mmCIF file of C-alpha atoms in Angstrom:
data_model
loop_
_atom_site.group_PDB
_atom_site.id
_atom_site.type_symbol
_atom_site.label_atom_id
_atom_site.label_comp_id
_atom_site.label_asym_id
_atom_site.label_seq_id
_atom_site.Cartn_x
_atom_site.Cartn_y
_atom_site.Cartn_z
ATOM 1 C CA UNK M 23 107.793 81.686 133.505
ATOM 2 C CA UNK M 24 108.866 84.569 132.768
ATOM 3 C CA UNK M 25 108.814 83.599 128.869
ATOM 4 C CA UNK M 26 105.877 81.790 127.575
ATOM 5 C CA UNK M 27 107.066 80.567 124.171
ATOM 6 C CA UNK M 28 106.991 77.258 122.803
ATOM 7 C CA UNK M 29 107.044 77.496 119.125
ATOM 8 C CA UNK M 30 108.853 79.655 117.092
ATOM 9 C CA UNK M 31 107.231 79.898 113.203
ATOM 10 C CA UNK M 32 109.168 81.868 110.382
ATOM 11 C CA UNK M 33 106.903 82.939 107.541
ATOM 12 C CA UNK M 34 108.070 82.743 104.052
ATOM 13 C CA UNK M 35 107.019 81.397 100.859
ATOM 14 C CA UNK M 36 108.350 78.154 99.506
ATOM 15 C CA UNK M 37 109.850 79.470 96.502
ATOM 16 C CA UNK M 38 111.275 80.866 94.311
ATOM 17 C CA UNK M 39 113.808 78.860 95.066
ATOM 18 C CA UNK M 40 116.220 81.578 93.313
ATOM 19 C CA UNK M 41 115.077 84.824 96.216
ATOM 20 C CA UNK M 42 115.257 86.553 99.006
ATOM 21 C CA UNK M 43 111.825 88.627 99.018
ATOM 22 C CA UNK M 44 110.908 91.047 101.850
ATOM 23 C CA UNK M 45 107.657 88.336 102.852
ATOM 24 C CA UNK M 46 110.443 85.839 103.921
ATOM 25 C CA UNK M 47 111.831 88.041 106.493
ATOM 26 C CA UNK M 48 110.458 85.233 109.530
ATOM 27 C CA UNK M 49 111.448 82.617 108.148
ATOM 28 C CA UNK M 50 115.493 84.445 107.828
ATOM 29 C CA UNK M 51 115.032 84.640 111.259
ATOM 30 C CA UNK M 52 114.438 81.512 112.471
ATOM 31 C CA UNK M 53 116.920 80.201 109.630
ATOM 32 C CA UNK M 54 120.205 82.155 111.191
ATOM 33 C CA UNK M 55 118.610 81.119 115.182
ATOM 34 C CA UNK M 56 118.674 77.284 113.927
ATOM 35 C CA UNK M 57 122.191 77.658 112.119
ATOM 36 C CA UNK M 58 123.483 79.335 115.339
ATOM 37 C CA UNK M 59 121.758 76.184 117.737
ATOM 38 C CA UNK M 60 122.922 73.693 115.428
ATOM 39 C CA UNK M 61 119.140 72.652 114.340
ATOM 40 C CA UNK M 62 118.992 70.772 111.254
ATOM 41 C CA UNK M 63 115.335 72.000 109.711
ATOM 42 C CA UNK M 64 113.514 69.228 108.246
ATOM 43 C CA UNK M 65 110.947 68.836 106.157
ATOM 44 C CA UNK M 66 107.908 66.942 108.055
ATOM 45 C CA UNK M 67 105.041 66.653 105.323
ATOM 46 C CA UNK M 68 102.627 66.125 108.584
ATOM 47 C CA UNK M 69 103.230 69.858 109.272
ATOM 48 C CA UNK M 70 102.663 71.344 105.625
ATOM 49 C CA UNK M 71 107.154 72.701 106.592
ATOM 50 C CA UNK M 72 110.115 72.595 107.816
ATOM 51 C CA UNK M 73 110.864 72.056 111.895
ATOM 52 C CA UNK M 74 113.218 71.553 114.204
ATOM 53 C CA UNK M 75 113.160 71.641 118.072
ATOM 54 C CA UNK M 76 115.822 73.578 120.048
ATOM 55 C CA UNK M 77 116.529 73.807 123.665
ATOM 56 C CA UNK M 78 117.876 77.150 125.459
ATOM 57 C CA UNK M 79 118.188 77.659 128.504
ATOM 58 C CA UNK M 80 117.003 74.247 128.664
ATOM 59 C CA UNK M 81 113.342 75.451 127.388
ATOM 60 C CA UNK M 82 112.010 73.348 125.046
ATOM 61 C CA UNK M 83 111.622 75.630 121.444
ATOM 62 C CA UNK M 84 109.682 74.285 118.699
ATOM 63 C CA UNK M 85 110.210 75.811 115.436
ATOM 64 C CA UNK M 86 108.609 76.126 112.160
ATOM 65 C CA UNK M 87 108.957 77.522 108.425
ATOM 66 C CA UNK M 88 105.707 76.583 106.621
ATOM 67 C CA UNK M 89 106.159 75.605 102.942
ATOM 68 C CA UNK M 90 102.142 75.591 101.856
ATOM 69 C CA UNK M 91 101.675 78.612 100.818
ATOM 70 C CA UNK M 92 101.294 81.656 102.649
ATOM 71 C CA UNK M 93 97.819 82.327 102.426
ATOM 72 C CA UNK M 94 97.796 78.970 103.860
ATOM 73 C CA UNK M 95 100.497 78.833 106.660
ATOM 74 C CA UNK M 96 97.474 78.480 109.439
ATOM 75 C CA UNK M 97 97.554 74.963 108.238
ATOM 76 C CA UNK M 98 100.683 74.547 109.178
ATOM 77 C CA UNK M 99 100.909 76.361 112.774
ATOM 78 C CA UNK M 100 97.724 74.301 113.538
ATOM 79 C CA UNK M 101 98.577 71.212 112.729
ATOM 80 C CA UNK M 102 101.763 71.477 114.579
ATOM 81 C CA UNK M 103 100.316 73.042 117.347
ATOM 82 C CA UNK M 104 97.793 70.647 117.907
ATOM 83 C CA UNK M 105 100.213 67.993 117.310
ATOM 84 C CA UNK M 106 102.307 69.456 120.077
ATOM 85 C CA UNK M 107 99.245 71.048 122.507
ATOM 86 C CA UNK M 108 100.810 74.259 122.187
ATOM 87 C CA UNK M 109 98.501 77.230 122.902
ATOM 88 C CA UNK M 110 98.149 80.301 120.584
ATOM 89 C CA UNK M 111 99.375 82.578 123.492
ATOM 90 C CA UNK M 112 102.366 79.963 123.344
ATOM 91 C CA UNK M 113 103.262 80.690 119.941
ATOM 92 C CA UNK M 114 105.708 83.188 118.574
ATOM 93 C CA UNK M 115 104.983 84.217 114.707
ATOM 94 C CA UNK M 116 108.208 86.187 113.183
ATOM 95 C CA UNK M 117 106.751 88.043 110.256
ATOM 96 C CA UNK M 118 107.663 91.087 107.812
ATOM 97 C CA UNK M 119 106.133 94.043 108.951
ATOM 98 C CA UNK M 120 104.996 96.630 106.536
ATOM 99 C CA UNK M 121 104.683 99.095 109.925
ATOM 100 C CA UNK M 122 108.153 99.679 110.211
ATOM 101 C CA UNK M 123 111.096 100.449 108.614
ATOM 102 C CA UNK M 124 114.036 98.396 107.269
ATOM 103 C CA UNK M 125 116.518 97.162 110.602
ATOM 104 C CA UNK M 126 114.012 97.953 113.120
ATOM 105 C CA UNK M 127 112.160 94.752 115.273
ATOM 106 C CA UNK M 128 109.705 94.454 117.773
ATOM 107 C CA UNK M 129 108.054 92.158 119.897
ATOM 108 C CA UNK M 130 104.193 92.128 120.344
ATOM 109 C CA UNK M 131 101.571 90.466 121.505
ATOM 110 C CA UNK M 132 98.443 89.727 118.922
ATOM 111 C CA UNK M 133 97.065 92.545 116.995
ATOM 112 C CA UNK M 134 95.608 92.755 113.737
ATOM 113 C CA UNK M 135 96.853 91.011 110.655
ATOM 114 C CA UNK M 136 97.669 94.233 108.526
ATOM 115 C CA UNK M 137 97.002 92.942 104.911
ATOM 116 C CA UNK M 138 99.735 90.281 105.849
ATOM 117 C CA UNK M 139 98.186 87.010 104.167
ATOM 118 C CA UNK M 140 100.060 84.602 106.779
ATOM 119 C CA UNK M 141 99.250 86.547 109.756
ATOM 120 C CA UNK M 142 95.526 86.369 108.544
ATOM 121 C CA UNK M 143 95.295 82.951 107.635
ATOM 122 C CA UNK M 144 97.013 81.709 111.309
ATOM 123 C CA UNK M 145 94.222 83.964 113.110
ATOM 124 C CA UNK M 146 91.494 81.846 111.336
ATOM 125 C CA UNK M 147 93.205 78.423 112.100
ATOM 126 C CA UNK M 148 93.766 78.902 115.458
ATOM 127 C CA UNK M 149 90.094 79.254 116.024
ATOM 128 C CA UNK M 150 90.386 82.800 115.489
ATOM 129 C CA UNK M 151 92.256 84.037 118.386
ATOM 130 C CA UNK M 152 94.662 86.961 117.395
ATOM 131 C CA UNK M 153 96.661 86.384 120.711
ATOM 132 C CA UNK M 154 99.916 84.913 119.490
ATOM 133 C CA UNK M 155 103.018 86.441 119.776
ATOM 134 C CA UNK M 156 104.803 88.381 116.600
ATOM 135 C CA UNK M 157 108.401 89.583 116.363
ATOM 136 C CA UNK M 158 107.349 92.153 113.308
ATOM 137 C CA UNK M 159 110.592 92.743 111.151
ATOM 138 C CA UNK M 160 110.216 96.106 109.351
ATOM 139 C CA UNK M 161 110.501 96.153 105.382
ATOM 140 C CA UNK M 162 108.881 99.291 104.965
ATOM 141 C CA UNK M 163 105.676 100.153 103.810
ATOM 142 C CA UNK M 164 105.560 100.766 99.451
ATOM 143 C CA UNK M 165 102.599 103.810 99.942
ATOM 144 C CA UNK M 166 99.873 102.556 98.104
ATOM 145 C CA UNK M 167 97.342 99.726 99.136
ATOM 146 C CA UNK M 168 97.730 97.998 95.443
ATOM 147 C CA UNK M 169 101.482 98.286 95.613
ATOM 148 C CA UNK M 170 101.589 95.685 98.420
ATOM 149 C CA UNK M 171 101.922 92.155 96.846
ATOM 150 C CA UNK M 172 104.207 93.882 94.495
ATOM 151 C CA UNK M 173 106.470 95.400 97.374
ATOM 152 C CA UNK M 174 106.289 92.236 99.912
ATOM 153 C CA UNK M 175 107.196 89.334 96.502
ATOM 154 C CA UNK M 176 110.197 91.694 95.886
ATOM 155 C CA UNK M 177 113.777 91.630 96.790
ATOM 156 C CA UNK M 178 115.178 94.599 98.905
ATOM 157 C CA UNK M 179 117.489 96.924 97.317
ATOM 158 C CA UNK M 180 121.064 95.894 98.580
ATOM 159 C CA UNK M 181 121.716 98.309 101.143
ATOM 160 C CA UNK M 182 118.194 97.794 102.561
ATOM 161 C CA UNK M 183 119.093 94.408 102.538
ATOM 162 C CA UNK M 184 121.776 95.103 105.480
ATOM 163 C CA UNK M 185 119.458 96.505 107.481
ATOM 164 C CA UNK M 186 116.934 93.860 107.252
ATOM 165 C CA UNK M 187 120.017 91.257 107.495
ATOM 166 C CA UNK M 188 120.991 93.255 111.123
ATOM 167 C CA UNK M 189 117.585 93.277 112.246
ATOM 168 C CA UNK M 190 117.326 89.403 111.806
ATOM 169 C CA UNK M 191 120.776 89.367 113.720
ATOM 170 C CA UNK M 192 119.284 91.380 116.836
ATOM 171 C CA UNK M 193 116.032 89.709 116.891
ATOM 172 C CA UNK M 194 118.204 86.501 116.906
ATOM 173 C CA UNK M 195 120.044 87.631 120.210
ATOM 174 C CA UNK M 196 116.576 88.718 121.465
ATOM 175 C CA UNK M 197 115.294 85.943 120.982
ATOM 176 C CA UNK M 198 117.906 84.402 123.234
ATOM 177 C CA UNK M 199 117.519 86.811 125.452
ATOM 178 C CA UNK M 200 114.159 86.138 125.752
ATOM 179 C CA UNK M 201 114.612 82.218 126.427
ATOM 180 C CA UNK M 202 116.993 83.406 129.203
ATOM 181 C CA UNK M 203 115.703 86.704 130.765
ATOM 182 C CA UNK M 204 112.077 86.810 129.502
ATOM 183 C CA UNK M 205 109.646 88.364 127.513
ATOM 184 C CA UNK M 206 110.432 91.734 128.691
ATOM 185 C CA UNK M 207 114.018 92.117 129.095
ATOM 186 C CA UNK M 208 114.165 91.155 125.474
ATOM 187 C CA UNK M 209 111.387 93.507 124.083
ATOM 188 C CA UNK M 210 112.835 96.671 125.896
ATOM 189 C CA UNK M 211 116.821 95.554 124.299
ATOM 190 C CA UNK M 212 114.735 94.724 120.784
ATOM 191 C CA UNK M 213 112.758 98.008 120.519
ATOM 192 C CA UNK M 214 115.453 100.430 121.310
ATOM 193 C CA UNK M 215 117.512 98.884 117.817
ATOM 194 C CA UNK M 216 117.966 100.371 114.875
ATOM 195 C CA UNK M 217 120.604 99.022 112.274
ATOM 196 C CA UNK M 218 123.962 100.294 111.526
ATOM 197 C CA UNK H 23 79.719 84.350 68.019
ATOM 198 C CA UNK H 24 81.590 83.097 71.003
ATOM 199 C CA UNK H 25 81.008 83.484 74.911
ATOM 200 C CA UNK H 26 84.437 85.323 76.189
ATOM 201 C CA UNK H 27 84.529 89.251 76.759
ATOM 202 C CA UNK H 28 87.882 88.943 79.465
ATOM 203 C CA UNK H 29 90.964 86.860 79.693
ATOM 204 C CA UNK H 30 92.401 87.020 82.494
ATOM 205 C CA UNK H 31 95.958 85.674 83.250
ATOM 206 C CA UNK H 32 96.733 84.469 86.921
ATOM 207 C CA UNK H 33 100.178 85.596 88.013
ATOM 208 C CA UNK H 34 102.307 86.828 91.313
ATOM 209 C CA UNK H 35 103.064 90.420 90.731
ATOM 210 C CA UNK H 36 107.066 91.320 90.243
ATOM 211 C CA UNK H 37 109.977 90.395 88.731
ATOM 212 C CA UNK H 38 110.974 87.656 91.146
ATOM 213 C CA UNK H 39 108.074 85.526 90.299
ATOM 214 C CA UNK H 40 107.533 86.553 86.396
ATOM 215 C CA UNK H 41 109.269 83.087 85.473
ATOM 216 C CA UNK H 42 107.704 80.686 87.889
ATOM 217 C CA UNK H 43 105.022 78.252 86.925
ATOM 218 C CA UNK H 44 102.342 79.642 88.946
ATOM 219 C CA UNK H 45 102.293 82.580 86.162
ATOM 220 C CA UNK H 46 101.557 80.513 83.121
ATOM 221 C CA UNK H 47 98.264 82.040 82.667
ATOM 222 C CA UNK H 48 100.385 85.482 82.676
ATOM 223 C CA UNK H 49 102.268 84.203 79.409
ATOM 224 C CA UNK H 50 99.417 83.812 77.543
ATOM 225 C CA UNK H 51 97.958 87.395 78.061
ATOM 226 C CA UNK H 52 101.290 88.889 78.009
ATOM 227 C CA UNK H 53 101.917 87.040 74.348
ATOM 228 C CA UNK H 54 98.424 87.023 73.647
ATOM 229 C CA UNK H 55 99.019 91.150 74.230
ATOM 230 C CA UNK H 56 101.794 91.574 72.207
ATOM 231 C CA UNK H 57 101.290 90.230 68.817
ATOM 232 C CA UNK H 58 98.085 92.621 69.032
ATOM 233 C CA UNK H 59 100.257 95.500 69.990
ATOM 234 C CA UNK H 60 98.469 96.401 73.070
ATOM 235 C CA UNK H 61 100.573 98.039 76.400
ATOM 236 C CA UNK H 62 98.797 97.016 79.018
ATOM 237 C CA UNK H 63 98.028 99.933 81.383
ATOM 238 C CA UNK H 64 98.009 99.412 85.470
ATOM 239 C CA UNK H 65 94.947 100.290 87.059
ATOM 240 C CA UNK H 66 94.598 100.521 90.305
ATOM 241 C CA UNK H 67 90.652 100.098 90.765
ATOM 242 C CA UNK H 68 91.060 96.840 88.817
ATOM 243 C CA UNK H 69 94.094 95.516 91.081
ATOM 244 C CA UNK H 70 96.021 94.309 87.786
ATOM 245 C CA UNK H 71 97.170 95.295 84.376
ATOM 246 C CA UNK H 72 94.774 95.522 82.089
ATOM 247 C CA UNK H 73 93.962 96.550 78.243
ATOM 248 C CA UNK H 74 91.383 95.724 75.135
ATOM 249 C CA UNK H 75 92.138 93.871 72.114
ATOM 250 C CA UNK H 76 90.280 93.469 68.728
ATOM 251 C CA UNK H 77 90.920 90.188 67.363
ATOM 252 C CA UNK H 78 89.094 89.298 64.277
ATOM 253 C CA UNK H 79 86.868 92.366 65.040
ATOM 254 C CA UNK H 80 85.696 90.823 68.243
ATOM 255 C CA UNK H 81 86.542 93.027 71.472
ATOM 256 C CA UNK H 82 88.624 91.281 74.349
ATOM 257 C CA UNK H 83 89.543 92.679 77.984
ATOM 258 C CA UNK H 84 92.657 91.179 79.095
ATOM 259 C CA UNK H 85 93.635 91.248 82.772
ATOM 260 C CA UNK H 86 96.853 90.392 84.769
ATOM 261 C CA UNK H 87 95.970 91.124 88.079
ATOM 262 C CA UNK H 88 99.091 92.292 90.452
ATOM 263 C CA UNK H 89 97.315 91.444 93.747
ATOM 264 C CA UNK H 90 98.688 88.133 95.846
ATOM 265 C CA UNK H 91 98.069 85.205 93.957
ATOM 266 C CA UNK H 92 94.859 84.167 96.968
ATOM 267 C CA UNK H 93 93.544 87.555 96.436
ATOM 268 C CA UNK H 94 93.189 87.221 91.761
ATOM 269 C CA UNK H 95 89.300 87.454 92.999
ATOM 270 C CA UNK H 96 89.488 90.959 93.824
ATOM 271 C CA UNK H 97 91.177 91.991 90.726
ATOM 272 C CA UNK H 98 88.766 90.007 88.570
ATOM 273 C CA UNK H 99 85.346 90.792 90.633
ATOM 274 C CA UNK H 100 85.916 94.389 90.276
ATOM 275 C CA UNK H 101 86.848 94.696 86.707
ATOM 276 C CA UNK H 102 84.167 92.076 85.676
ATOM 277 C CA UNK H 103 81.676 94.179 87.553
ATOM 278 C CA UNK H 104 82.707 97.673 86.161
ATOM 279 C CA UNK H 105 82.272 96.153 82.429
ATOM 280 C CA UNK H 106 79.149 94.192 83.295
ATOM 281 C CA UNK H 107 81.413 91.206 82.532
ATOM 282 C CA UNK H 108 79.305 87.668 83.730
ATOM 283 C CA UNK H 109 81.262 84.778 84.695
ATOM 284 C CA UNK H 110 80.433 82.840 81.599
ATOM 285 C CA UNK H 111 82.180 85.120 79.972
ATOM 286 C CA UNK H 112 85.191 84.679 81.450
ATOM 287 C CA UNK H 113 87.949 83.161 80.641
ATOM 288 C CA UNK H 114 90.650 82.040 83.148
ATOM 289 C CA UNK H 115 94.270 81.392 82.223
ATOM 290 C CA UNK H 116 96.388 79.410 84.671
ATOM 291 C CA UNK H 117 99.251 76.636 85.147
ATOM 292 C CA UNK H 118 97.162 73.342 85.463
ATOM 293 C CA UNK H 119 98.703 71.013 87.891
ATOM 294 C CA UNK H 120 96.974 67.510 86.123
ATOM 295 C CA UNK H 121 98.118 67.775 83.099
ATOM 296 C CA UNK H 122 101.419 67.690 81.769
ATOM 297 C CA UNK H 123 104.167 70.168 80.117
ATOM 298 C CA UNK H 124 103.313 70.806 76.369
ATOM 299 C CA UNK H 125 99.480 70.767 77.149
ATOM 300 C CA UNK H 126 96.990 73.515 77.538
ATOM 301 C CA UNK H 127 93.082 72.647 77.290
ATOM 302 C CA UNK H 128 89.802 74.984 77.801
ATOM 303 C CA UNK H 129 87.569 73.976 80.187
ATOM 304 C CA UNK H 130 84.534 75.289 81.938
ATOM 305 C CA UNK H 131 83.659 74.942 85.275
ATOM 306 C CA UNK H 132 85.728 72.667 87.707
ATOM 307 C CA UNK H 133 86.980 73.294 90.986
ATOM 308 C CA UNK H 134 90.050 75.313 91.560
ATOM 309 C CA UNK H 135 92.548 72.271 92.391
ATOM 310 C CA UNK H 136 94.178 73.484 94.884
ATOM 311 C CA UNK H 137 95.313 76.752 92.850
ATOM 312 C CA UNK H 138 94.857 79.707 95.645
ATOM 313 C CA UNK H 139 94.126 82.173 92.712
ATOM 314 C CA UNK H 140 91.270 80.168 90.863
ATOM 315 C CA UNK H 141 90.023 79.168 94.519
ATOM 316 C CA UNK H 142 89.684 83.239 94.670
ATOM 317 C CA UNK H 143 88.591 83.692 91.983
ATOM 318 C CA UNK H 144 85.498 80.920 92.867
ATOM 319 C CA UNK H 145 84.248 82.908 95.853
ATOM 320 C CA UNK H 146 84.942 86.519 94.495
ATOM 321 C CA UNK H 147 82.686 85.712 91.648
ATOM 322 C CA UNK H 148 79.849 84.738 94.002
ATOM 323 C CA UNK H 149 80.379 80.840 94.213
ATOM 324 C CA UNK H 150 79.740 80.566 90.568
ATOM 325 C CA UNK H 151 82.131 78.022 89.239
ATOM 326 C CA UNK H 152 81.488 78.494 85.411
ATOM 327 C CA UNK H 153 84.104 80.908 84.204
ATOM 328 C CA UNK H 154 86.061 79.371 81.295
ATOM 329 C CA UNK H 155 89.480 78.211 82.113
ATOM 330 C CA UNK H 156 92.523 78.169 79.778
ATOM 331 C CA UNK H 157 94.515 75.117 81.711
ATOM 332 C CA UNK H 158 98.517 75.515 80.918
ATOM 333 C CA UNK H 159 100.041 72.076 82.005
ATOM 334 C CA UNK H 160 102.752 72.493 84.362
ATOM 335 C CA UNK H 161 102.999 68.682 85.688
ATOM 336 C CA UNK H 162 102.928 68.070 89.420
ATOM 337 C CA UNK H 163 105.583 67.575 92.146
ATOM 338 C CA UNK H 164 105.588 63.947 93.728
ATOM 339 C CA UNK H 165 104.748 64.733 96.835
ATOM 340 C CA UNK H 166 101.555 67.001 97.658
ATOM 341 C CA UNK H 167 103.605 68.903 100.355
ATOM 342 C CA UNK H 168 105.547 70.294 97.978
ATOM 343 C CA UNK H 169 102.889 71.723 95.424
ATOM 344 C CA UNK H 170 103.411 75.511 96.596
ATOM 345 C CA UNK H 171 107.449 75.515 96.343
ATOM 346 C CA UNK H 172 107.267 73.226 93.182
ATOM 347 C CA UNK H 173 104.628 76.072 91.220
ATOM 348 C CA UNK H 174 106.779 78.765 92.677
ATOM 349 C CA UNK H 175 109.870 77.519 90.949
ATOM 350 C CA UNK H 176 110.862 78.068 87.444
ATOM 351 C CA UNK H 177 110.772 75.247 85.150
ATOM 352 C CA UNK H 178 113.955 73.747 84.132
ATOM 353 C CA UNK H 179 114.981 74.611 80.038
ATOM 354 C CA UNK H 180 113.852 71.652 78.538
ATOM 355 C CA UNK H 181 110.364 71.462 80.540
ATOM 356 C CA UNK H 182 110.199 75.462 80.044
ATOM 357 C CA UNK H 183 110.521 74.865 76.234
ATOM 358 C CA UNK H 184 107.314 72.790 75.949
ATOM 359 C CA UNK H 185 105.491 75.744 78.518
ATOM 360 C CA UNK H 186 106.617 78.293 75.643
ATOM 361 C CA UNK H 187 105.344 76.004 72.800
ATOM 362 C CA UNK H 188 102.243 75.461 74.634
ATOM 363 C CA UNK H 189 101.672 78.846 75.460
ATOM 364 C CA UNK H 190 102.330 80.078 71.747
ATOM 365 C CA UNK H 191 99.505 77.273 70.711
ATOM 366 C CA UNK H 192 97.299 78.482 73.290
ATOM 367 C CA UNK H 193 97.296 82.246 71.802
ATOM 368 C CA UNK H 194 96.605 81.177 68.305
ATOM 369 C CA UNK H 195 94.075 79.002 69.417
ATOM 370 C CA UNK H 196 92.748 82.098 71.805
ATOM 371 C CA UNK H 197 93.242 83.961 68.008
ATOM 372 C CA UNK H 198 90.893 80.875 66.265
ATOM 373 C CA UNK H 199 88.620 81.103 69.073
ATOM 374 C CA UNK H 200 87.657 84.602 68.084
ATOM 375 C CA UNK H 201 87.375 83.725 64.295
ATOM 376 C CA UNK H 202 85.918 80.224 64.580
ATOM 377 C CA UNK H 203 84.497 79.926 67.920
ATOM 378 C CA UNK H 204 85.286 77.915 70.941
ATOM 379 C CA UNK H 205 84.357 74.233 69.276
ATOM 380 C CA UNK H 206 86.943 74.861 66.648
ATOM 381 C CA UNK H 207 89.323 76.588 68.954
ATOM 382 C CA UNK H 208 88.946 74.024 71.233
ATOM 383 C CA UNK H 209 89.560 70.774 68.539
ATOM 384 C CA UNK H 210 92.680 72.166 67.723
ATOM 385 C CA UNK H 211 94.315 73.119 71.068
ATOM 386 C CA UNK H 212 93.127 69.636 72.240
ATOM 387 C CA UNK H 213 95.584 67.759 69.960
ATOM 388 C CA UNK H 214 98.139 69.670 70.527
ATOM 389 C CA UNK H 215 101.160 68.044 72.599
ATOM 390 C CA UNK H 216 104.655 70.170 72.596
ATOM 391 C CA UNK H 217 107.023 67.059 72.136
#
């Protein structure tokens, strides 16, 4: 109606504390949309994260930053989900994206998991269904297939570090965009960004 | 005579995560490494870092594999299988939630204990549970919840001191192991308690 989104989850892992590694790239985003809404993120143990619960446009917006680990964040999307009785189709996953460049964004609709342990791991606990939404952040993709875990656990250079930091601040505004105008007014301002 | 052809050290690839807890098992290879002047090479088939000491004559693969910590199995399965490498022959180094800092023990078999690498490991290697481990106390968090963010932190000085101590004890016992064998190797590491 026109926007079918009910929870909002931001992937990361829960440490080090001391880092700001390409595979926390969600979890920036739903950071900076909670510090702009006022949301306090707490920890609820029941959820395996951090949540909060936002309204925009006075549409209720769950959101979530797992802190199992990531292999394991399906635990946590389920459990709130269920909690909640929030579809799959309901839920929003923002992710780093190995497809696509650093401070580029896009909105999609399920999909494969792409070697992204998260993404994997929520497919399986939520009974398998790959039909969840994902705002993909782009880090880039390292080349090689071994190179991954390497490439995703490290920490952008600096100035690839302001475009990821500009493409969290669009898909923030997108994401308002889309609690206000819907799913595809934001997608088609999203997709046509690229930073600085 | 003594049952371990590979060590393997569980760690998260990269500099970022080189000094957090869940890499214990790293330190010991790394060290272990080191004093026997070997450069570990990076090998792509093998998903890790890998090289061959001689210790007291004996011939030991090491292995830090530089996949995701969930996905050690892969690293370990295919290097195990190239050298015709059986479980039992394994030996698994990794930070050991039950036990405290300043305390490493072998062990084999177990279950993984909520570690995501040895729980890998478990079903890479076919189910079979009866790899040797090399458990690095780490201590635990208080609350369960925070297990992942607490073994992806560093360890403060003081607690990291009694890691270092116990990872140093753990190589010369690793050393003892392949002059002695794993009953006298094992006596010794098991009074050990960095204070």
């Amino acid at each position: 109606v026109s926007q079918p989104i009910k929870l909002l989850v931001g992937l990361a892992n829960p440490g080090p504390e001391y880092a700001k590694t390409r595979h926390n790239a969600g979890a920036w985003v739903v950071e900076e949309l909670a510090r702009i809404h006022n949301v306090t993120l707490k920890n609820e143990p029941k959820f395996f994260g951090l949540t909060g619960r936002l309204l925009i446009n006075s549409q209720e917006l769950r959101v979530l930053i797992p802190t199992t680990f990531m292999n394991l964040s399906g635990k946590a999307i389920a459990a709130l989900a269920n909690f909640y009785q929030i579809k799959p189709e309901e839920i929003m996953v923002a992710h780093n994206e190995l497809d696509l460049p650093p401070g580029v964004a896009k909105f999609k609709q399920g999909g494969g998991h792409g070697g992204h342990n998260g993404l994997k791991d929520t497919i399986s606990k939520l009974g398998n269904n790959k039909e969840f939404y994902r705002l993909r952040l782009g880090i880039g993709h390292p080349g090689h297939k071994d190179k991954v875990a390497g490439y995703v656990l490290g920490k952008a250079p600096a100035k690839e570090q302001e475009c990821l930091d500009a493409a969290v601040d669009e898909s923030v505004r997108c994401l308002e965009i889309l609690m206000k105008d819907g799913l595809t007014k934001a997608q088609n301002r999203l997709h046509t960004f690229k930073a600085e």
